Amino acid sequence: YDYHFEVNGTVVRHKNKGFGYMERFFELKESCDERSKLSKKQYERFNALFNFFEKNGVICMAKDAGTLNTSIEINSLAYHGKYDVMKKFIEEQSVSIEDDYKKAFFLACLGRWEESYDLYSNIILNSIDESNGCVYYLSQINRYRIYQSITQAVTQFNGLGLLTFGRHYKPFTDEFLARIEREMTNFNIDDLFNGMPFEFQKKYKILEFLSDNQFLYDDTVKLFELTNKVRSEMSEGSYSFGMSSDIVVLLRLYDNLRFLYENCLWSVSFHEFHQYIRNSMSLLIEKAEYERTRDIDELGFSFFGKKSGFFMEYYDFVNISRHFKIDDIKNLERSCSIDKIRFGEQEKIEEYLVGIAEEITKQFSANGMNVVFYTQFISEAKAALYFAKYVKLSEEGLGKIVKALLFYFPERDLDIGKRYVWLERLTKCNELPKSIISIIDDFLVLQAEKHIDQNYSEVSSNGLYSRDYGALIKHFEKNFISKRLSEITLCLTQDKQKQIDFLFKLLPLLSTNAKSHLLSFKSVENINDLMNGIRIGLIDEFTPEHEELIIEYLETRKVNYIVEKEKGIQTFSSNDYMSTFGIWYFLEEINNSKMEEFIGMDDQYDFFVDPENFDYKKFIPSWLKNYNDKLLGKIAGNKHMKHHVIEVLKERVKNSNDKRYLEILMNYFI
């Protein structure tokens, strides 16, 4: 505790006594002649210490300090995810024991936990003889951590892995599990440091925290400074000169990350560290958002309007990708405004993302996919692809990423719907060029080939299917007409019923003769068929016969409704096709005006048919929940319904106070 070393690389005296050896050291380093005075052996020792301090970013004393720049640089293939380089290094024949240590860490990162355990045991056996206290201690700790990871992995696999994966995996032979369980009997990590040579215990005390069940607790408890509200109103900025709580927290996070990844400690993989990074980065981003919003409230939006109080770099992007879950990314997205943050170093991020794409195109295109590696790697892959919305990409990296996501991604993790939302996210900034439009076309074609079989059927949690991919491609290229889908349609026959339906979903993309032969199979014979065609099949316009169907069923139910008035009874109306006729009579889809005679049955049908005389007291605001985007826009357009539903949405947000109602209230109307 003689000095207070600081994240920026500034030393400060603290409870020291007598001669200031650090101030003398820095004065000596600055002046060369003073160094010339020093003894030869002490000169070489000074050169060693100079290189050490320079490497660890210790520059000078606080008073002598100034515009100290800080640039994190973690030099570790594990951190950068250079999987091929790690494997090549593993194949190479080790020279020293440090090479074995790094190789064991690389093996663990690559999922080969059995080999990592074996190599750590070897390293322990050799290093106890070689009197390498540091390597012996760190290998012990990393073997215990890999053993814990193996145990939790077998627990998860036996409990649920067989279920989620669809088949049981036995990553570890029961003989190996028995061997490790027998070896680690009664092995308490706490005594490890205390049983060491007192020489090592004295010199390497800074490593004692590694054995302890948990660390970062002083770093975690120091995250509260990012939850301060007084700071935005008035911040002392006294957490550190020329710095703040934000800078200190970020540099402390980088210190912890570099120390663990560069010293090749397995604790980087545990839940404690992941949650630590989640908390730190989320709190930093939220603090930046809070400061930006308060500045916009105090100063005009012209000032601090979209300030990048936080500024993502390569290391920030990889942190978020590796340590966050998709739910955490969604939490940050909804709470903060991630689009207001600017992303730098985008070329290195593009390299990292194309490396992710390559790794998923190798890991799964190949018949074999290490399962223990897969479970940890797929979360990072899908988080990185999810969080690539804000980063821009070149056509080549974007092409590889789209190819890998659409075709070389597991279906277990990303269904068709989640694949679609990932892709659309990628399209926000890197608006689709034709090169990846071709990839999307190929994906749709493969989906059709799968749909040829009568058992296949898409599964989607978000309710989006290949029709959405078709809509996206058509939206970005208005007149795109795939040739392969067109020839699939032409080769089509009535026997290929499910393929017929699928191609019907993708109707816009098909050529004239293709969609002609398609719609040849299907036709409308009644109002049920008409609504089925409009809903699916895209009945472009209500032909005169279609309008006759509308009127036929409308008057049939008009007679039925007269008989209902005679009953005084109306049990239920399963499908109000009259509501559809209304939105279709409000959309000018029905040129015929006869149905205007039919009115008074459904308050919604009156709402759409003759809104002017329609009593808007009847109107149910819940209908606005169901109305599509264009329908709400039109309702805003029509003068008679505009103000009335302005009032109804105002009342709903005023009384019920629901938030989707507010979204409809303003994002569309006012």
Binding residue for its own copies (CB under 8 A) from 16, 126, 151, 232?
A: 232
Torsion sign across C-alpha atoms 641, 643, 647, 652:
positive
Q: How far is CA 426 from CA 1, 18, 336, 398, 409, in A?
A: 50, 61, 19, 8, 15
Q: Using the rule CB under 8 A, is 526 a contact of its own copies?
A: no
Binding residue for its own copies (CB under 8 A) from 100, 246, 316, 328?
A: 328
Report the first-to-last Cα separation within the chain, whole angstroms. Answer: 62
Q: Using the rule CB under 8 A, is 652 a contact of its own copies?
A: yes
Q: Using the rule CB under 8 A, is 648 a contact of its own copies?
A: yes
Q: Using the rule CB under 8 A, is 82 a contact of its own copies?
A: no
Q: Using the rule CB under 8 A, is 282 a contact of its own copies?
A: yes
Side chain identity, residue 419:
R
Binding residue for its own copies (CB under 8 A) from 94, 331, 361, 370?
A: 331
Binding residue for its own copies (CB under 8 A) from 12, 247, 296, 445?
A: 296
- Stretch of 209-217, 506-514, 549-557, 563-571 lying at the interface with its own copies (CB under 8 A): 209-217
Return the HEC string of 297-347: HHCCCCCCCCCCCCEECHHHHHHHHHHCCHHHHHHHHHHCCHHHCEECCHH
Q: Using the rule CB under 8 A, is 129 a contact of its own copies?
A: no
Shorter beta-carbon distance to its own copies: residue 508 or 621: 621
Shorter beta-carbon distance to its own copies: residue 55 or 617: 617
Q: Using the rule CB under 8 A, is 337 a contact of its own copies?
A: yes
Question: Binding marks (x or -) toward its own copies, 235..254, rule CB under 8 A?
Answer: x-x-----------------
DSSP letters spanning 142-202 = HHHHHHHHHHHHHHHIIIIIHHHHSS----S-HHHHHHHHHHTTT--THHHHHTS-HHHHH
Q: Using the rule CB under 8 A, is 307 a contact of its own copies?
A: no
Q: Which of 235, 329, 240 is nearest to 282 (CA)?
A: 329
Q: Which of 317, 295, 309 is nearest to 341 (CA)?
A: 309
Shorter beta-carbon distance to its own copies: residue 43 or 224: 224
Shorter beta-carbon distance to its own copies: residue 64 or 191: 191
Torsion sign across C-alpha atoms 659, 665, 668, 670:
negative
Q: Which of 80, 140, 142, 73 is nearest to 107 (CA)?
A: 142
Q: Using the rule CB under 8 A, is 458 a contact of its own copies?
A: no
Binding residue for its own copies (CB under 8 A) from 220, 263, 532, 638?
A: 220
Side chain identity, residue 583:
I
Q: Which residue has the tokens 């109103």?
A: 233
Q: Using the rule CB under 8 A, is 276 a contact of its own copies?
A: yes
- Stretch of 23-31, 36-44, 229-237, 371-379 lying at the interface with its own copies (CB under 8 A): 229-237
Q: Using the rule CB under 8 A, is 206 a contact of its own copies?
A: no
Q: Using the rule CB under 8 A, is 212 a contact of its own copies?
A: yes
Least Cβ distance, residue 232 to its own copies (angstroms)? 6
CA–CA separation, 12 vs 652, rounded Å?
A: 61
Least Cβ distance, residue 427 to its own copies (angstroms)? 24
Binding residue for its own copies (CB under 8 A) from 55, 229, 478, 565?
A: 229
Q: Using the rule CB under 8 A, is 52 a contact of its own copies?
A: no
Q: Using the rule CB under 8 A, is 298 a contact of its own copies?
A: yes
CA–CA separation, 523 vs 539, rounded Å?
A: 10
Return the HEC string of 104-119: HHHHHHCCCHHHHHHH
Shorter beta-carbon distance to its own copies: residue 538 or 670: 670
Q: Using the rule CB under 8 A, is 660 a contact of its own copies?
A: yes
**What's the helix, strand, coil split of the chain in %, to 5?**
65, 0, 35
Least Cβ distance, residue 381 to its own copies (angstroms)? 18
Binding residue for its own copies (CB under 8 A) from 135, 180, 223, 354?
A: 223
Q: Using the rule CB under 8 A, is 617 a contact of its own copies?
A: yes
Length of the chain: 670
Least Cβ distance, residue 303 to its own copies (angstroms)? 9
CA–CA separation, 281 vs 267, rounded Å?
A: 19
Least Cβ distance, residue 424 to its own copies (angstroms)? 21
Q: Using the rule CB under 8 A, is 33 a contact of its own copies?
A: no
Cα angle 575, 578, 584 (rounded to 5 degrees) comes to 115
Q: Using the rule CB under 8 A, is 650 a contact of its own copies?
A: yes
26 within 8 A of 36, measured Cβ to Cβ: no
Q: Using the rule CB under 8 A, is 654 a contact of its own copies?
A: yes
Shorter beta-carbon distance to its own copies: residue 506 or 653: 653
Q: Using the rule CB under 8 A, is 573 a contact of its own copies?
A: no
Least Cβ distance, residue 375 to its own copies (angstroms)? 16
Q: What's the gap between Cα 638 and its chain centre?
A: 41
- For the CA atoms of 70, 71, 72, 75, what is the dihedral angle to 10 degrees? -140
Q: Which residue has the tokens 């210490």?
A: 49
Residue 274: exposure state from Cβ atoms within 10 A (0-12, 13-18, ≥19): middle
Binding residue for its own copies (CB under 8 A) from 299, 446, 491, 538?
A: 299
Shorter beta-carbon distance to its own copies: residue 92 or 212: 212
Phi, psi dihedrals of residue 311, rounded to the nearest 5°: -140, 100
Site residues (vs its own copies, CB under 8 A): 15, 185, 212-214, 216-218, 220-225, 227-233, 235, 237, 272, 275-276, 279, 282-283, 293, 296-302, 325, 327-328, 330-331, 334-335, 337, 617-622, 646, 648, 650-660, 666, 670
